[PDB]
């Protein structure tokens, strides 16, 4: 299979799933709720055990009222819809979704090696070969997504999970949208937010390649290229365009980053005629066997400790919160088609 054939075949499967979504229904009382795995601006994700099978999953729980207040209605509908329709080795899989009077639930595959974030912060930084390994998966993953005219828009270590073989699983499709032309929503974790987004311009898939630049930088540096006290000041720095690199960055890494962290869309790698191939062929990815990575035949730079099926020792502890369900339906209209 050539990539053209693989992706055109991928587009055909996706469109079918898109047009006739499967019946992935379940009910809350079917799962035993173990422990909170992580939290974000919108949702709480819990380790759960299916009372029947004994299988573990990660259940994302969203409060309808909160989703409405934070204005994530269209985003949350996108999230579930895109998740159940995509299929790629490094996208977390959606197993069930459903809702009750109060909440929306997305029950995913449980990725048990914790966030990339927590490993990155603890180790301090990733060697360039280590960063390169994760970076290659994101590249292949954006290739897949962008061929489907999907943009991801929230790339960060907090949204990337390490599996049992030490590979990346992209989770949180909260900002994922099908965009064939342009889109306008001011969204995306601040440090990773593309300039064109901040400038309130219409933007496209190219914002993800900016975000890839920020990721790769943070992975090798141990800190992101643009940071400050308040999100305002950060945006100033992102728009300024001036990036400074640490002295230990190889010369290739510096060059790739210069071409990803390009404020001018006409120059940004992944947005040129050659497209994604400008990244795949850049000096820094010379030793990358792009196919072998897709087939997961390459040895991961490390593999997290495992101590059982429902072991959560790779995740931080979070304060456990009661899961409340109203006796009457709430936001019946806003989430009618969930």
């Amino acid at each position: 299979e050539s990539v053209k054939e693989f992706l055109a075949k991928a587009k055909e499967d996706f469109l079918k799933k898109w047009e006739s979504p499967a019946q992935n229904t379940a009910h809350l009382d079917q799962f035993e709720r173990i422990k909170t795995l992580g939290t974000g601006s919108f949702g709480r994700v819990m380790l759960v055990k299916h009372k029947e099978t004994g299988n573990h999953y990660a259940m994302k729980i969203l409060d309808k009222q909160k989703v409405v207040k934070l204005k994530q209605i269209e985003h949350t509908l996108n999230e579930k819809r895109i998740l159940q329709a995509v299929n790629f080795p490094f996208l977390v899989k959606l197993e069930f979704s459903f809702k009750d009077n109060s909440n929306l639930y997305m029950v995913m595959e449980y990725v048990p090696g914790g966030e990339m974030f927590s490993h990155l912060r603890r180790i301090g930084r990733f060697s360039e070969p280590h960063a390169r390994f994760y970076a290659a998966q994101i590249v292949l993953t954006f290739e897949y997504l962008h061929s489907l005219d999907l943009i991801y828009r929230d790339l960060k270590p907090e949204n990337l999970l390490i599996d049992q073989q030490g590979y990346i699983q992209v989770t949180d499709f909260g900002f994922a949208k099908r965009v064939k032309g342009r889109t306008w929503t001011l969204c995306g974790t601040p440090e990773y937010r593309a300039p064109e987004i901040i400038l309130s311009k219409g933007y496209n898939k190219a914002v993800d390649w900016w975000a890839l630049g920020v990721l790769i930088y943070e992975m090798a540096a141990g800190y992101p290229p643009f940071f400050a006290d308040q999100p305002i000041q950060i945006y100033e720095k992102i728009v300024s365009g001036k990036v400074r690199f640490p002295s230990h960055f190889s010369s290739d890494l510096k060059d790739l980053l210069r071409n990803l962290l390009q404020v001018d869309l006409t120059k940004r790698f992944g947005n040129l005629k050659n497209g994604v191939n400008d990244i795949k062929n850049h000096k820094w990815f010379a030793t990358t066997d792009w196919i072998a990575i897709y087939q997961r035949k390459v040895e991961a730079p490390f593999i997290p400790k495992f101590k059982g099926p429902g072991d959560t020792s790779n995740f931080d502890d979070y304060e456990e919160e009661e899961i409340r369900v109203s006796i009457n339906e709430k936001c019946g209209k806003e989430f009618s088609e969930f």
Binding site: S41, E115, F117, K156, C187, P190, Y223, F227, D229
Partner: peptide, 19 residues
């Protein structure tokens, strides 16, 4: 140093989409 600057920024912990 940049690394020191990072620590004193207060944004070294988990980042949410909205702050």
């Amino acid at each position: 140093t940049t690394y020191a600057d990072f620590i004193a920024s207060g944004r070294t912990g988990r980042r949410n989409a909205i702050h």
